[PDB]
Structures are given as structure tokens and as C-alpha cells.
Write a protein that binds this ligand. Sequence first.
Ligand code: POV
Ligand code: POV
Ligand code: POV
Lengths: 234, 234, 234, 234, 234, 234, 234, 234
Amino acid sequence: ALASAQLYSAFDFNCPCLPRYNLAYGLGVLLVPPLILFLLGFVLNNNVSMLAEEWRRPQGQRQKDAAVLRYMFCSMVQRAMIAPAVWVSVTLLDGKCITCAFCTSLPVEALGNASHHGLPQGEVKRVLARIPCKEIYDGQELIANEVAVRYLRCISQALGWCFVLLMTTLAFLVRSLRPCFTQAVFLKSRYWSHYIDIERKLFDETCAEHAKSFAKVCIQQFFQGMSKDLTATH
Amino acid sequence: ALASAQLYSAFDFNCPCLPRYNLAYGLGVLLVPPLILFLLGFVLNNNVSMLAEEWRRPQGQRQKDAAVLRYMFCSMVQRAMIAPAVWVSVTLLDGKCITCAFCTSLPVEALGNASHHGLPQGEVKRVLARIPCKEIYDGQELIANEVAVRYLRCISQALGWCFVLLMTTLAFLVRSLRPCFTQAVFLKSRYWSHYIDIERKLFDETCAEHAKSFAKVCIQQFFQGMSKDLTATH
Amino acid sequence: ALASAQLYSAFDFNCPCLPRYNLAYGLGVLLVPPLILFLLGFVLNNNVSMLAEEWRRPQGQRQKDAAVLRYMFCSMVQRAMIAPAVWVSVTLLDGKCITCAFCTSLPVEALGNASHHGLPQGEVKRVLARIPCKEIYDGQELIANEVAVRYLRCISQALGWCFVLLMTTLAFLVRSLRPCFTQAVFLKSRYWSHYIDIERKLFDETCAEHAKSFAKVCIQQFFQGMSKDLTATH
Amino acid sequence: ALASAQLYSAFDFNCPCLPRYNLAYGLGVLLVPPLILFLLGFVLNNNVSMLAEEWRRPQGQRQKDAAVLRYMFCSMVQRAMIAPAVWVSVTLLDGKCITCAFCTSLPVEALGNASHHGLPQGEVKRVLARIPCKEIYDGQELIANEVAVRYLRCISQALGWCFVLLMTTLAFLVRSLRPCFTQAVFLKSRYWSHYIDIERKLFDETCAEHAKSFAKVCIQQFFQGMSKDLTATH
Amino acid sequence: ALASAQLYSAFDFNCPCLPRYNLAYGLGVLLVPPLILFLLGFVLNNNVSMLAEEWRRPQGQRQKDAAVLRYMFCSMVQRAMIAPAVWVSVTLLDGKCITCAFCTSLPVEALGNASHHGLPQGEVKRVLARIPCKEIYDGQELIANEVAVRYLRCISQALGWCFVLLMTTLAFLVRSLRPCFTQAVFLKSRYWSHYIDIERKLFDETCAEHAKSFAKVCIQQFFQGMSKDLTATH
Amino acid sequence: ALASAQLYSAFDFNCPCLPRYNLAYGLGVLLVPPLILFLLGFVLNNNVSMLAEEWRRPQGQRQKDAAVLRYMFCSMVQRAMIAPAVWVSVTLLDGKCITCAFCTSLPVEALGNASHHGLPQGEVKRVLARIPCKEIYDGQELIANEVAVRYLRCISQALGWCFVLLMTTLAFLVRSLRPCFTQAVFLKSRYWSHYIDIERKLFDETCAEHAKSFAKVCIQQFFQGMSKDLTATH
Amino acid sequence: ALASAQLYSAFDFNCPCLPRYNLAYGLGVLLVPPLILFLLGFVLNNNVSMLAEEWRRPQGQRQKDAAVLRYMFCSMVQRAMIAPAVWVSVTLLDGKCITCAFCTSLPVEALGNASHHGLPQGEVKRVLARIPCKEIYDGQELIANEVAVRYLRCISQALGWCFVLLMTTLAFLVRSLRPCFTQAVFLKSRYWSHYIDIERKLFDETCAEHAKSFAKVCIQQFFQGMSKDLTATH
Amino acid sequence: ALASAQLYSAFDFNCPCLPRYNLAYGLGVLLVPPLILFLLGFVLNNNVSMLAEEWRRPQGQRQKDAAVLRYMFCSMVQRAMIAPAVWVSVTLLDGKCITCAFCTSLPVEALGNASHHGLPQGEVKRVLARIPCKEIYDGQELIANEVAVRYLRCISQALGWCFVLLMTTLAFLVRSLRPCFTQAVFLKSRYWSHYIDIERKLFDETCAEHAKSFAKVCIQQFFQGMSKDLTATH
Ligand SMILES: CCCCCCCC/C=C\CCCCCCCC(=O)O[C@@H](COC(=O)CCCCCCCCCCCCCCC)COP(=O)([O-])OCC[N+](C)(C)C
Ligand SMILES: CCCCCCCC/C=C\CCCCCCCC(=O)O[C@@H](COC(=O)CCCCCCCCCCCCCCC)COP(=O)([O-])OCC[N+](C)(C)C
Ligand SMILES: CCCCCCCC/C=C\CCCCCCCC(=O)O[C@@H](COC(=O)CCCCCCCCCCCCCCC)COP(=O)([O-])OCC[N+](C)(C)C
């Protein structure tokens, strides 16, 4: 979870100031890295195999239970949401992922300069699009680069807090209510966990103990056959 | 509690210098993050489920007691107030959350420049609003940017200390008085806590001990059936 | 105690250069933060409840003693004075809390420039008041900003050391004399402390031991009722 | 795995701005260091010898099993892919390895300057090739150096995330499915590991114990033969 | 002792360049902080009360001895001198505490400029006094500010080493000679220390052991009276 | 091994820009430091003496074995190659050791300026030789100093990776194949190691135990002969 | 010993450029701090009292021995020389303590400028004396300030190494020869040390054990006399 | 050994640019510090006394042996060479100790400027000598200061590596050959070491045990004679 925030510093955002690629490159940085951390939430878990080994059979003779599986699945999905939830928020509290996503859509005749200063309806996208990357901006007449960053960098943080609110309100709601939390079905899941754990621990003990009783018959053939006597003796 | 103060440095405040959005964006940074830490105070607690499982039934056959619940609820709410209390204070001891909230309301004909220098009653909001963000300020004639920050940044810290005073005086008052602190009802709550704890500890012992007595009948079927003899023996 | 000094660095002093608000904003930073740490000295203590539970009854049937309470009260007040004592001193060894408190009162015709250079008796407050905040000072003729800071920043440190002297001389005096230090009454207080401590420790032992004898009758109802047999057995 | 990322900082990339060598020097930094970490993944493993000692005999009398080997091989290859997978991604999230690979191929008459400004079809490679190394660039007329880095540095990160997605989706797929994961064959592999380990541990015990029973007959010949008496005695 | 040196860095010396206040503000920083650390040396000690409780009675029936007290007193005073001794030296090895103490007294017609350049006998104090604070110095003609700091900053360090010499020579003298060091009286003091220590340790044992035998009769009244039965039993 | 890389930072490379000394000073920094670490690999080992003590006799009556020695020798040589292998690579990934080795050999009429601009065939070495040390370069006309460093600094890193590839491919090959790895001869070597170790440990025990039985007869002659009585007794 | 070197950084050398005071202030920094560390070497030792208590009596009835004292004295003096030896060397390896000691004595007509350029035989001291403190130097004609520092700063380090040589040669000589190192007298000194140590350890045991047998009769008078009963019992 | 390298940073080299003193001051920094560390290698050893006590007698009745001494001596000398060996090398890998040693000897008519530009055969030493200390160099015509440092700073490092090679080749040679390494004589030396060690350990035990049996008769005379009764009893 903590690695989700620090890796954002390693990434070096930069938006290609082009008309139709901004909307692609912006959202992609917003949604795809979440999707990675979602799937990555499963492979790090250990019970993922049991579901596939169990859910693979479309015959109904499944071993564990019809209801315990639904619980264990719905539980594992919850502990996965934490990683992508952190990413989508902390990236929304910066604006850079959003400042160049919709930069080619804001209104200029409302908060910026006048409605028109002598440019067609096509170059406006050609000119507004370069709002980020404050080193090549040919639209200082149409709107100030310093202001148009404030208007958008602000709107981002609104979605930032309004997102974190709707997220925590959801955790507070499922953490204290019905969604497959029943007392009976809970004991089954917690019990089958210990069965899986002491199995692996108890198996390793018997195997190693079986070898030690068997390897000794081999190590008495390398010995007593080299020379049966050391020549280096004085 | 300590994470409430350090996260303020991670956030990068910046106020959109517009007439009617300041008052929105200012207060929102003041109140919403508190509301997050309030709800977050519950989900981190563990007894939250017991209340919902208990308070859900609107029938009166509740198990624990009619009075113990009211205590445990009123206790949990107290340990939640600490987080949002720290946020609302330390953010009030900076002014940035408040300097742009009411910047479009102070009087200019009292501490600033003269009463009027040739501007209508509409642009004053248009001009005063940009007092923060000291890079685009077209009102150096109407009031100095250096002074108008002092007048407001000062008034903030007054509410800062005056808030922390009324807060600590409240803690000192409830920490040594009546609010459901009775000796009898207290023992019930402290007793039902240990019942919940040694339950989980004592349950895990019996389950694991039950598996170990049962798994051994399975591990004697993988063994003694592979070959009953190692071929690698010399 | 140590947090009293370090928090001073977190606070960012700045004095609103106005005529009648300096005297308010100055002293407030001097006295109010002390008052916070005073009350905060009680809520962190644990015996505060016993006094309120005991001193509440205005009937005279108080349990502990008529004299032991007076000792325990007068003792707790002493260990509270340490925090505000550190604050009022270390803030007096800087002048910033005092340089703008009385900056509108010093004499100019004594150490500064000439007695009068052509200004009325009203603007002198209007002009002298801005002595701190060395970026907008319209009184370079009436007195040098570099000198008038020395005269006041010096007078502060006089009260600084003269305060710490009168403080330590008071600690040295009460630490080795009469103020309710009698041998008899002392043993009562030290004895009732251990009674309060081993009570809480001894109570938790019996309660937890009572549950463990009782929870076992419940955990034999979830078991032996699931199936009495594992289906996953080979 | 972690050393794969940090060593990238030690390496100091720099692309020789020549026409036909870019495409060589670029890909080489992309593919060769992966190939090193692949082979290096084997030599650090310990079971590599057993395969060669076993797979060397092309006669079919192999000792372990016909199926266990295929598992152990296919398992070892998996834990090797992690190192080169990290390299090829983190180097694709920078562009420098890719910005000079294809810099001599992008279109100029699409996103850059005009289609032609008076240069033949040969020097374009001669001029475009020096796009990186922003100190000797004789093509400021044909396309801006600041823009042409954005267009390519962006396209890299697309392959960056699109690579990491297809990678993690592959791990999630093989981590929960068929590829030689059968229960029977698994026990063989895990069992032959312990045999190899307790062998080395049990052999060292017997050898050292055999010497200690034998060395003592030698150390009684250096002693009792020096003088049988110390001369330094008083 | 070590805190005496480091606190000097926290203090921010600055000398008010006035005629008759230098001599006051200079010595005060030299002597007063010593006097604080002297008295502070007592309150941190623990035997201070015994002297006051003993020396208070002006009747001669004192308990301990007529001679042991004189030893214990003369011993405690010695371990106090270490703190102020460090302060007065390390502050003398800087000159700032002394450079502005006597700056208005040095001779100008000896090492500085000529004897007289056209100023009365009053302004010389008015002009020489501002020698420190090298930002407002109207006496560059009468003596160079760079030289007059060397002459005084040097004389300080002479008293610095000459002080530390006379100090260590005093410690070496009393550390190996007569001043109430007799063998007989020494054993009394060292013996009465252990009596005071094992007293407090042995008292706490009996009191706590007495409560535990008594509290149990109270904790059997909260129990067995709540309900004698848990309702939450299944 | 790790000290091989860090010591490179301590060394301060600098190439004497002369015609025929570059080729000497360059290669010397490349090959000689390797040769040091090779020989240093032996003296740090401990079995080096046994070979010399054994291989010295050119008579054939050698004690250990005719075959075990060849193994132990060929093993020790392998663990020595690691140090010089790291040096020759990491120094090839910088170019400075190679940029001035062959700087007087590259072609100028291929990638640099024109074929000839008015200089004989002798001064070209006189002029090209100073390509490194970019402070005295009299050949800005014949070829740019910025480009000619790229051409050579690049060619180095080609040999860098191409070297590390051929190295790791060699380790992977000998780590899993024939070169005196036979099972029989291996047990001899591993067995004679323990003999050497427990010998030194077992010898030190007997010697120290022999002295302690003998020193006691000496320490009863200094005692009981001083005076047989202390005079300081009271 | 190590504190002798680090304290040199704390001291801030600066030489008063005057004719006859240099020679004083220079040597004083060289010799006096040594003399401090010499005497300080004794007071930190513990056997210093025994000598004074023993050597005080000029009667010849001394207790320990006529010869053992001479050894213990000559031993303690040796372990004191280490501190001042380090100071006098490391301060000689800088020149600042010596560059201004003899700066008014070097020859100018030998390594500096010409023999005479128009100044009397008195001002030469007046002018040469200010050679250090390279901010006010009125002798740039008579000799360069940059050179005359080299000539003297060099001569210092000659005495630096030549001192450390004669010092270590002395330690090597006394560390392996006659100066009261005899075997007989050595055992006396080493024996009387243990007598002094186990005395203090054995005395503290008996005294504390004597109090504990005695304090108990006092603690049974504060108890059983308060009330013999707690009133707080329920 | 490691302190030999770090102390080089503490020393601040600087060469007095004079004709005949360079050759002195240069070599002195090269050879003398080695000679210090050589002698210092002995005094830190402990067996140095035994040799002097033994080798002092020129009579032939020496106690240990005629051959063991020669071994122990030749062994101790070896472990001393390590310190000065490190110094002479790491100082040769910088040139500063050598750049000003022979700076007044290199040829100018070979690698520098022309053979003669109008100066006699005497001033050449007068002018070449100041080659280091690149702030006063009056020979920019005769040879460039930047080049003449390269020519000499290079030649140093040749002797640097060529020295370390001949050194390590010597260690590798004596570490595996004849120089008094015989098996018989080795056991004597290793045996007499343990005799010396357990002697000191066993002596301290008997002496301390003898005092404890004797001090008790003294501590029963200070006790039972003070008063035989405490007066402070209640
Ligand atoms: C300071 C530290 C810095 C941190 C870094 C931060 C940045 C991080 C950025 C990114 C992180 C990305 C992580 C990737 C996923 C990791 C797991 C994995 O890969 O395992 C899989 C790999 O084995 C396979 O099955 C893949 C095989 C596909 C072939 C790929 C060709 C590679 C050669 C190149 C030729 C290219 C030519 C084409 C050119 C386009 C499966 O093996 P496993 O054993 O089952 O894995 C267990 C996984 N577990 C451990 C998670 C449980
Ligand atoms: C902060 C730290 C910095 C990190 C550094 C980061 C940078 C890293 C960069 C690069 C890392 C490169 C690592 C190399 C591989 C290492 C392993 C190895 O080499 O072992 C082999 C070496 O022994 C041989 O078999 C090779 C012999 C070939 C002769 C080479 C001539 C050398 C002389 C020069 C003349 C040249 C003249 C020609 C000039 C062109 C085999 O021995 P082993 O005992 O079986 O090895 C076990 C290996 N194990 C330990 C892995 C299990
Ligand atoms: C942060 C830390 C910095 C790291 C530093 C990095 C830089 C490192 C740079 C370089 C490292 C170089 C290391 C050198 C080799 C070390 C080992 C050695 O020397 O031992 C030998 C020395 O004893 C001898 O046998 C040599 C005697 C030759 C005489 C030399 C004259 C010296 C006086 C000067 C007059 C000159 C006059 C002429 C002027 C030209 C043998 O003794 P040993 O007991 O058998 O040794 C065991 C060795 N072992 C411990 C390895 C097992």
C-alpha cells in the first residue's frame, strides 16, 4: 500500500501537448496503473489457487462448500481494493494527471481572456492544448498560463477530497453491516485456514525425518572405502 | 493523530483567485478533511461491529444491556474527536486556509488605502479576490498586498489559539466529571472486553489442535505409496 | 516539557503593524499558550478524577482525609507549573513576542532621533507601530529601524534572565521547606497510590480468569455441530 | 531483483548521434543486459548441476523421474524471469533507451515543422539523428528539439505500462492454473529437496567426528618430545 | 554540565550599543547565568532536604552528628561548582560577552588612530560604544573596526586560559588534600546514604504487600453481584 | 569484490596528452590493477601454503594425492577470477580508461571534419592526442571535442557489455559441467578441510591445558615470600 | 586523548597583529593548554590521594614501601604525558600557532623582496607584524603576503614531524627497557590495586546488609498506627 | 592500518616554492611518516619487552631458545611493514608529494615550450620551482602550468602501481615459502604465547582471592566502634 504512493515520485509525468493525444495519455496514467495493482493484489495472495482449483469444475461436486467459497472470494476482493484506491486519490490531489486531460476543453470566454481575438475554431484546440509544459505556449493572448493552471489544478482537488469521502464512507458501511458477515459461515473460513497451514508444517517434518532414517545407509559407502586409513599420519 | 499534522505538508494548498469560488474552496479544505478523519476513527476501531449487530434490532431484546451500550458508544466517539481536532487547529495556525476564504470581504477604507480610487462596486470583488497568489495582483493601488496578508493571517491565529483553548477546556471538563462515568456501569464494559479477547485466542487453539489430530490420517496416503523405496540409493 | 520549546519553532510569529492591535496580539501570544499548557497539565494526570469525585460532595463525609487531599492537590499543581514556566521564559529570550508589544511606547527623543521633525502626536503611533516587519517602514527619519530593535530586543532578555532567576529561586525555596511536606501526611499519600495501582492490576486478573472458565461451554457448540467430519479427507 | 533497478543509475546512458549506429546502440542497451540477468539467474541457483548431471545422459536410465525433472526445470525458469522483466520495464519508463533508438524514423511533416525546407532525403537522417544530446543540434528549423523529445518520450511510456500489464496478467494466469502444477508430481519435488539438504548437513557431522577420533594420535607426538620440561620454571 | 555549553548556542547575544548600558548588559550575561546554574545544582540533588530539616533547629539536638553535616554540606557545594565553572570559561573564550563590556574604555591614542581628530571628550563614549554591531559605526576615522575587535577579542582569551588554569589548579589541590577528607568521618557519610536508600525500597515493598492482602475483600463485592450469570451464553 | 568497485572512485584518472605515452598509460590502468587483485586473491586464502609445501617436492612421494591437489588448485584459481573480472568490466563502462588509449587512432575523415585542412601527417597525432582533458585542445577545426568523445565513449561500452556477456556465459558453463567436478574426488577435498580445522582447534586446547597445570608451581614462589603479612593492617 | 584534538576546532585562533604581543599570544596558546591537560591528567586518576596521604609524612614510617611508591608515581606520570603530547604536535601541524609567533623575525632580504625600499628599522616590525590576518596588510611592497605564509607555515610542519619522531622514539625506548620495570617491585603494585578495589566493594555489602537488619524496626511504627484499618473499604 | 589512509586527509600538504627546499620538504613528507608508523608498530605490540629482556644479556644463557627468538622477531617485523607500506603507496597515487619534489628537474625543451626564450641557467630553477601553488607563477611563457602538472602527476602514479605490484608480489612470495616457517619451531612459539596469557589471568585470580580473605579482619574495626547503635531510631 505504501509502495503505491512512493512509486509515484519515481514516475516522471509529462504530457505530450497534442490535440487528441492528451485525453488518451492523461486517463491512461489514471486508470491503467490501478488495474495493475488490482491484479497484483491477487498473485501476492496465497488462497488464489484454491479458488481456481475449486471453481474450475463446473459440475457442482465442489469440496469445501457452496457458501464458504462466496465468502472467501468476496473477502479477498476487499483487501485488493486498498492499493488502487490509494493510487487514484493521491494522483488526483496533484492535477498533473488531470490538468492535461481536459485542458483542451475548458471555457476561455468565462474566466480567461475575451471570447475571440482573431483565431478560428480549429486552432483553439491547437493552442489551448499546450497549456501544461510552460516553455512553449503560443497563447499568452488567449489566456494566461498562470491562471488556467489554477482553474484546473483546483477542480482536480475537488474530485480528490470528494473521492476520498465516498471511499471512506463505503469502507465504514461495509465494515459494520451485512455483506456475507454471518457468524456461522465465518467459522468455516477461519477453520479451513489453520488446516491449510499446519498441513504444510506437519508434512515437512515427516519427509525430512524419513530421509534422515534413509540417508545414513548411503554415507557408509563413501566412508570405509577411501583407504580406511589416513596416509598423513605421523 | 500524528499523521494528521504531517499529511498537511504533503497537501499543496493553492486558492483559485475567483470571486465566488474562494469561499467554497476555502471552507472545503477546512471542514471536509476533518469529516474524513472522523469516519476513519470508527473503521479503525474494532467494537464498531458489536454496536451495529446489537443496535440493528429495533425490538428491545438486546443482549448486553440498555446502559452499557450507551457508555461504550459515548466512549468511542470521544477517542475519535482527537484526530479532527488536531486538523482544524493546526490548519488555523497558518492562515492559508483562511486567508483566501474571507479575502473578498475585508474593509479597505479602514486599514488599507483610501475609500475609493475610481472603481465600481463590482470589480472590488474582482480585484480584492486575487490577494493571495502574489504573482498576478492588479490592486496595488487599492491596498498593499504585503499589508492585507498581515491583517488576515493575524486574525486566523486568534481563532487558532481561541479554538485550542475552548477545546482543552472541554477535555479537562469531561475528563473529571459526570458524563456516564459511573462506577457500576464501568465494570461491565471493562469486563465484556476481556470476554471478547480471550474468546478469539481460545478458539484458535482448539481449532488448530483439532486439525493436527485429523491431518495425520491424510499424510499417510501420499507416503508409502510413491514407491516405498528410493531409487537413488547406491 | 521539551515539547514546549520545540513547538515554538513550528509557530510562525508575525505582528500586525497596527496601532492598537499590537498590544493585544503581543500579550496573547505570551499568556494564552501558557494557559493551555496549565490545563493540559491536569488532563494528562490520572489522579484528577479522584479529587472531583471526592471534592464534589459539599457535605464533609469525604473518604480519604481532610488533610491528605490538600497535600495531593498542592502537589499536582506544582508538577504543572513546569510546562508554562518554560514557555514564558524561552519566549522572553527572543524579543519578537515583546518587541511588537511595546514598540508603540518607547521614547524617541531619548535614544532615537530628535524630539520632533514635523509630525503630529497621532501619526507617531501610526509610524512607530510598524517597527517590526522590516519591509514597510515609513519612519527612517524619526528613528533607525536597526537601532530601535536593539533597544527593545535587549530589554526583553533582561526580563528573561530576571524571570528565570526568580523562578529557580522559588523552586529552591519550596523544594527544601514547609509547604505541606510533613512526614506523617506524606506516608498516607504514598500509600493510597499503591492501593489504586494494584487494584486495577488485580481486578483484570480475576475477570479474565472468570471468562476462560466460562467461554469453554460456548465453543463446544460451534464445534461438533458443523458436520463432525471433514469432507476433504482422502 | 532490487539490484536490477539501482544499477541503472550507475550506468550512464549516452547515445552516439550517428545515422546507423543509433538503432544498434539503442536496442543493445535494451536487450543485452536482460540476457545477462537471465543466465545469471541460473548460476545463483543450486539445483542447476543436478539437471546437467541428469540431463547429460541421452540414454533414458535417468534416476529421479521422467516427469519430476520437467517440473523442476519449468519451475526454475520462472524464478529467473523476474530479474529481466524488471529491467525491460523500468528502462522503458524513461525513453532514453528508446528516444535515440527510433529518433531517425519519426515523421516531421505530421507533428513537427513543414514537410520540406530545402534539404535532400539523405541529410534528414543526418540531421534528425542528433535529436538527443541537446548541445549540437543543427535542425532547429526542421523540428524543435523540445517537442520532438516529448513525442518520443511519451510513446515509450505507452509501451512501458502496456508491457507491465501484459506481464502481470501472465503471472496472474500461470500462478493459478495448469502448467505442471499437479498435486502428485509436486510432492516428489518438495521431497527430493530435503534429501539433498540433510545429506550435506549429515555428512559434515560424520567426517568431522571421524577426524577428532584420529587427530589425537598425532598431537601426542609433538608434545612429550620437545623437552618434557619447561626451562623457564623458577 | 554538557548542557551548559550547548545552551550558549541557543542564546543569541547582541549588545545594545549605548554608553552606560553596555557595562550592565555585558556583565549580566557573564554572572547571572552562572548564578542560575549554582542554585540549580542544589534542587537537582536529593540530600538538600535533610540539611534544611536538620539545620533548621537552632537548638543543638541535631540527630546525625555535629561533624558529618559539615562534610556532607562541603561535599555538595563542590559538585555544584562544575556547572558555573564551565559557563564562565567557555563564554570568556569568545569575547562577545567581553568585547562590548569594556569597549567604551580602551585607549585610542595607543594602538588605534591619532590621539585627537576633532571630537570632544563626551562623544568618544558616544562613538566608541558602537564598536560591536558592525553595521552602524560612525567612528571609522577614530579607530578601525577591524583592529579594535582584535585587541579586545584577544584580551578575553587571555583571561580565558588564565581562568581555566587557576580553576584546574584548585581542583587538583582540593582533590588530594585536607579539606574535611578524614577517614573516620567519611565512613559515617557513606553509611547514612545506604540507610536512606534501602529505606525507601523496603518501605514500598511492605505497603504494596499490605494492600494486596486487603484489596481482595473488595473485589468480591463487584463480582458475584452483577447477575452471577452471563446472558450472552448460547 | 565490492572493494574493487569503490576503490575506483578513490583513484583519480587523468591521461597525459602526449603522442606515445597515452597507449602506455591507458592500458596500464586497465591491466595492472587486475594483476594486483589476482595475486592478492591467493595471499588472502589459507590453503596456499599446503600447495607450496606439497608441490615443492619434485619427487612424487606427495602425501595428499595425485588428483586431489589438481582439484584444490583449480578450485582456488576460480574464486580469484571474480575480483579482476569486476575491475576490467566496470572500468570499461566508463571510457576514460579507453577514451585516451586509442584517441590517437580514430579516423577523422569518416565521422569528424573534412579529410585535410592544412596539417602534415605528424601533427595529427600531435593534435588528436589531446582529445581528453578538455581545457587545452588546439584541434577544434579538425574535429569537435564534444563529438569525438561520444564516438569513443560509446565503443567502450560495447566492449563493456560484450565482455560481461562472455564472462557470465563462462561461469554458467563451468558451474554446471565437467571441469574436475567428479563425485569421488570431491569428498576427499571436503574431508581434508575439516581435518585441518579441528586440528588447530584441538591443539590449542591441549597446550593451554598443559600450561595451567604447570604455571601454578611458579606463582607459589612470588607469593608467601613477599612478607607473608600485610603491614597496612589496622 | 581524542578530546584534545577535537577541542582545537572549537577554539577560534586569531593573532593580534601587534609588535610585541604576538610572541606572547603565540607561545601562550602553545604551552598553556598543555599545562592544563597535564594537571588534568592527575585529578582524573584515582591513586593521586594515596601518594599525598603517604608522601605527606616527612618522617619515613611510610606504610606501603620505599620503592613501590617511586614506581607508582613514575607510572602515573607516563600516562599523563599522552594528552599534552597530542596537543603540542597537532597544533604544530597547522602553523597558525607558529605563523604569528615568529612572523616579526624572518628575513626579508633573503626570500622576500629587496633589502630596503625606504622604511626605517622600526616600522619593519610595525609592518611585518601584520602578516597573518590577510585583510589589513600595508606591506605588499616589502614582501608578498602569499609567499611569507608559505615560508613559515612550512617551517612549522618540519618541527611537527621532527617532534612526533622524537616523541615516538622515546615511547619505544622506555616501553622496552629499565626505568623501574623490575619484576619483583611490579607484583607489589599490581597486588595493592586489587586490595583497594575489593575493599570498597566488600565494605558496601556489609553496610547495606547492616541497615536492612535495622530499618525494619522503624517501619513497624508508621504502620499499625495510622488507623489499623482502611476506611475506603466497601 | 586504516588510520594510515584517513590521516592523510587531515594533513594539509603545501610545498614551499623555493629552489633547494622542495627536494627536502618533498621527500620528508614521503619517508618520515613511514618511519613513525614503523616504530609505532612495535610499541603497540606486547612481546617487545620479552625480546629486550632476553636479547639484553650478551652471554648466551638465554632462556627461551636460540631459534625461537629469531622466529618471533622475524614475525613481528612483518606485521609492522603493513602500515608504512600503505602510506608510501597512497601518497604516491596523488603526485602532490612528488609533483613538487622533482618539479625543478624536468626537461622543458622536450615536452614544454621552446629550449630558450631569454633567461639564464640560474633563474630556470628560480622559475620552474614555483610550478605547484598555481597562484604565483611567473613562467607561463617557459611552460604551461596546466601541462607540466600532467607530466609529473602521471609519472607518480606509474611508481604508484609499480610499487604496489612489487609489494604484493613480495607478500605472496614470503606467505608461501621458507623464511623461518618450519613446523617444529612454529609449535614452540605458539605454545609460549598461551603460557604468557593464562599466567596473567591465573595470577589475578589468586591475588584478589588472597585479599578478600584478609580485608575482612579490617572492616570489623570501623564497624562495632562507631556507636554500636543508631541514634536516628524512632
Ligand atoms: C527500489 C526498488 C525499485 C522497485 C521497482 C519499482 C518499479 C516496478 C515496475 C514494474 C514492476 C513489474 C513487475 C512484473 C511482474 C513481476 C512478477 C513476474 O513477472 O513473475 C512472472 C514472470 O514470469 C513470466 O511468466 C513472464 C514471462 C513473459 C516473457 C517476457 C519476456 C522477458 C524478456 C525480455 C524480452 C523483451 C522483448 C520485447 C520488447 C518489448 C511469473 O513468475 P513467478 O515465479 O510465478 O512470479 C511470482 C511473482 N511474485 C513474486 C509476485 C509472487
Ligand atoms: C557497490 C557494489 C558494486 C556492484 C557492481 C555492479 C556492476 C557489476 C558489473 C558486472 C558484473 C560482472 C560479473 C562477472 C560474473 C561474476 C562471476 C564470475 O565471474 O565467476 C567466474 C569467474 O571465473 C571464470 O571462469 C572466468 C575466467 C575468464 C578469464 C577472464 C580474464 C580476466 C583477466 C582480465 C584480462 C582482460 C584482457 C582482455 C581485455 C578485453 C567463475 O568462477 P566461480 O567461482 O564459479 O563464480 C561463482 C559465481 N557466483 C559467485 C555468482 C556464484
Ligand atoms: C578506508 C581504507 C582505505 C583503503 C586503502 C585503499 C588503497 C590500497 C592501496 C594499496 C594497497 C597495498 C597493500 C600492500 C600489500 C599489503 C600486505 C603486505 O604488504 O604484507 C607484507 C608486508 O611485508 C613485506 O614483506 C614487504 C617488505 C618490503 C619492504 C618495503 C619498504 C617499505 C618502507 C618504505 C621505504 C620506501 C623507499 C622507496 C620509495 C620508492 C608481508 O607481511 P605479512 O604479515 O605476511 O602480510 C599479510 C598480508 N595480509 C594481511 C593480506 C594477509
